[PDB]
């Protein structure tokens, strides 16, 4: 009920957050009883908004649905409501406005980029009463949400999956925008280079080993403190290699001690056989002596008789000894047959085992849009505990429906490439040009600038966008440290379905480690017959240089080897993405690079405050703000993350330029 509302908003139901503490210091420092009243009001308001996100939830309409005693304190309710509204926890996205927007605007904000982060912030700012204009370099909106549309064919070249609805803000958006969400069937069969499937046994054996190897790197990091090597941050790739090398070492160590047990025992045999051979000689010589003494025929003196009798006894004793040694000979002989029949494992992983493992590594390289040797060992999975619950889905009608819908009613200047960002104590001015005719210049004056340029663009050297004055070192250093990955897609449009329709995805196992991410995975998720191929890891960057024909050629080859040469027709339509080359992206999405950490995401999010114009003048207002996937530590590299960063900055900007009434 109210607890689900908190969960769906990424909030603890029974506790106040740091953000809430800042706006309600009176309540958090006060008695527990009052804190409980606040929590209920907050959760209930969230629930109301969540129950019907198609219409604006006003303060009036909120007080209405609340029962006593909660509905007694009208100010506390009003405060909580405004707080939620301002921070975009309620009334965000595309909803029917009950109170038509006041025609009179306050403040002027220029937003650089019209991707999801920029669009989300714009809606919020416009909704707050500010003058908002967005500048997009492309001839469209959505940025990294790029949908290919030709006829009935629909395929996403950028973001494609909604990663669980539980706690995901995209769930609200999906009720506001007609999104044909379809569950992803987890079943993923693999096909080796030769085109033959991988048996259930191996598939599971390698996958389990893969997870075991990752868990091992975690141990190696947290317990053995292997995080720095040669004054360099250890990468996930390095850690995996070391772990694998050590598993190969153990296999060899077990082998050695097994063959050493054999020799030790075989040396026990050597000694025993040496005894037996000498004893057999002793027995032979004694037998002769007895026979010679036995010759002397009765009757004989007592010494001659003693000789016979004594040698008889001595021989009996020695014959008993030999029998006991022969008893021991049979025990060791079979002990050796048992050991020789019990060899330990020959290899840690066979060539085929390694190739299948490389597919899992490629899969991980896809997830993080980067080769494993670039990922921070200590932090690559820092955002793990924030994953949403529920099954992963795809946008069957193309993800672009989201940005397009969010663009409705906004002032967006397309084909406008921002070139320079000037920010001072009295305001800002952004210099941009027409992408179609670069000489045509545009000047935009504003009170604040919200920068949503991708990390790739911010990294560009020489820079594509100049900041005046330059960004401070703390900001640029973060930019240099943070990783900006790459991953590409190959859209293959056909006229007929020649694949297993109940199978959403299937993999192709590359021959070598180097090419593991090369067209390693195929997606079958749309209405029309379309196959989407992934290019991850080191392959992504290299394949951008290869032409479409050659890429499609390789795709066809792979599919032929799997479905038969006379079953794969020549594609009617093909598209290949090149995110790194794309001047407005220069990569796909951020990753936690070795040497970086979740803290850099926070640094990326901090606004910039210019120095004073007049010396000795009071401390200016922050003027330059940042949003975007690379500015949200808990959900980076995602659509929801971008969306949330936009909502965050809108609240901070509004608080700064329109003032906060709910803090008092």
């Amino acid at each position: 009920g109210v607890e689900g509302a908190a969960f769906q908003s990424r909030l603890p139901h029974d506790r106040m957050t740091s953000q809430e503490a800042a706006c309600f210091p009176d309540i958090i420092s006060g008695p527990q009883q009052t804190q409980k009243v606040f929590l209920f009001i907050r959760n209930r308001t969230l629930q109301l908004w969540l129950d019907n996100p198609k219409i604006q939830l006003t303060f009036e309409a909120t007080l209405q649905q609340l029962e006593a005693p909660y509905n007694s304190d009208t100010v506390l309710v009003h405060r909580v409501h405004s707080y939620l509204e301002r921070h975009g926890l309620i009334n965000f996205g595309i909803y029917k406005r009950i109170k038509p927007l006041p025609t009179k605007k306050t403040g002027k904000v220029i937003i650089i980029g019209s991707g999801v982060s920029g669009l989300a912030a714009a809606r919020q700012l416009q909704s707050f009463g500010m003058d908002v204009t967005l500048l997009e370099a492309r001839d469209r909106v959505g940025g990294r949400v790029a949908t290919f549309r030709k006829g009935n064919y629909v395929a996403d070249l950028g973001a494609m999956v909604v990663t669980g609805l539980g706690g995901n803000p995209m769930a609200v958006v999906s009720k506001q925008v007609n999104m044909e969400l379809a569950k992803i069937k987890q079943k993923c069969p693999l096909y080796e280079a030769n085109g033959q499937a991988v048996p259930k046994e191996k598939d599971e054996m390698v996958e389990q080993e893969f997870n075991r190897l990752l868990e091992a790197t975690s141990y190696l990091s947290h317990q053995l403190d292997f995080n720095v090597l040669n004054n360099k941050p250890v990468s996930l790739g390095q850690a995996l290699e070391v772990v694998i090398q050590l598993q190969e070492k153990h296999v060899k160590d077990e082998q050695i001690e097994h063959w050493k047990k054999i020799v030790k025992t075989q040396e026990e045999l050597k000694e025993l056989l040496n005894k037996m051979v000498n004893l057999k000689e002793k027995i032979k010589e004694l037998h002769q002596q007895y026979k010679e003494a036995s010759e002397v025929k009765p009757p004989r003196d007592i010494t001659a008789e003693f000789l016979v009798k004594s040698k008889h006894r001595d021989l009996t004793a020695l014959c008993k000894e030999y029998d006991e040694l022969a008893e021991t000979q049979g025990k060791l002989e079979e002990k050796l047959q048992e050991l020789e029949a019990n060899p330990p494992s020959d290899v840690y992983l066979s060539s085929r085992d390694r190739q299948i493992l490389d597919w899992h590594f490629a899969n991980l390289e896809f997830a993080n849009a980067t080769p494993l040797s670039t990922l921070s060992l200590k932090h690559w999975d820092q955002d793990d505990d924030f994953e949403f619950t529920g099954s992963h889905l795809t946008v069957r009608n193309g993800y672009s429906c989201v940005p397009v819908a969010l663009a409705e009613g906004l002032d967006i200047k397309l084909n406008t490439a921002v070139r320079q960002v000037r920010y001072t104590a009295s305001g800002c001015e952004v210099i941009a040009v027409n992408t179609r005719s670069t000489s045509q210049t545009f000047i935009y004056k504003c009170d604040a600038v919200l920068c949503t340029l991708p990390l790739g663009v911010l990294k560009q050297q020489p820079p594509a966008v100049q900041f005046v004055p330059p960004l401070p070192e703390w900001k640029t250093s973060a930019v240099q440290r943070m990783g900006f990955g790459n991953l590409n897609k190959v859209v293959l449009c056909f006229d007929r379905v020649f694949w297993d329709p109940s199978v959403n995805l299937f993999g192709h196992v590359g021959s070598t480690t180097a090419s593991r991410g090369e067209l390693f995975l195929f997606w079958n998720l749309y209405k029309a017959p379309i196959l989407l191929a992934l290019v991850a890891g080191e392959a992504a960057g290299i394949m951008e240089n290869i032409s479409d024909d050659v890429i499609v050629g390789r795709c066809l080859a792979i599919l032929k080897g799997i479905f038969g040469s006379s079953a794969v027709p020549q594609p009617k339509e093909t598209v290949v993405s090149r995110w790194r080359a794309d001047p407005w992206a220069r990569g796909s999405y951020s990753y936690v690079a070795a040497g970086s950490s979740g803290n850099d995401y926070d640094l990326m999010a901090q606004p910039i405050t210019p120095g004073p114009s007049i010396p000795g003048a009071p401390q200016p207002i922050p003027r330059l703000f940042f949003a975007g996937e690379h500015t949200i530590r808990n959900y980076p590299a995602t659509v929801h993350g971008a969306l949330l960063s936009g909502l965050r900055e809108a609240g901070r900007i509004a608080d700064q330029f329109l003032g906060a009434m709910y803090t008092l």
């Binding site: 999956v161 990663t163 669980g164 992803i184 987890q186 993923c188 990752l214 899969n363 991980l364 896809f366 997830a367 993080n368 690559w380 999975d381 955002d383 793990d384 619950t389 529920g390 099954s391 992963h392 995805l505 990753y591 590299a637």
Partner: peptide
Amino acid sequence: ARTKQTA
């Protein structure tokens, strides 16, 4: 951010 296709 690990594997992705899970729950």
